[PDB]
Design a protein around this ligand. Sequence first.
Ligand code: CA
Length: 223
Amino acid sequence: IVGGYTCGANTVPYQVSLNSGYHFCGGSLINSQWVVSAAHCYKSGIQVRLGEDNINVVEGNEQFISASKSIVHPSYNSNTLNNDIMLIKLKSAASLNSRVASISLPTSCASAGTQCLISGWGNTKSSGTSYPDVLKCLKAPILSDSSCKSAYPGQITSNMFCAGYLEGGKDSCQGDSGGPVVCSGKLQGIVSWGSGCAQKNKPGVYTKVCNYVSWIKQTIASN
Ligand SMILES: [Ca+2]
């Protein structure tokens, strides 16, 4: 997160860190046994880390649970990042408490101009490089589809939306991939892609979760 703020320990209780010997992507806890992330975050050998603030210190509220299965969306296209969404099933259920909690799936899609909360342990500069140890947060608005399409012509599908600031300075970044965009108490986006981070006229591009609720519910009901 570029241009954000320190969240506060366990104030984003649905945020997870995906670890494959090191933190590599975020995700969101949607019930006691399932996490949503980005398909471009796929790796073998994922451990899900819940209740994290400082990812480099064991502070006492963490739960570390290995993934039993990963399921990339059937229509994921790694070239275009269309359908950039993946489910991860935990080997054992998480214990839900004030520090570890699930986030609701949306019933309706979110509105342009809604201010959302984006969070992660990704890079905090442009191509300066500096990765934080504690969780960072950013408030950012949903941009109109026409502004999104103008910023990335020929690249935006109906399964993507843009959020952030056209002036630049505030954005998600590498390492925040797979993490949440929460608007009005619902998971509306997944950190997906962008040209650089926090560059002028290059806002963040997010997977549109409300287009995937049927797939998520059917997959959880069968696995
Ligand atoms: Ca920790």
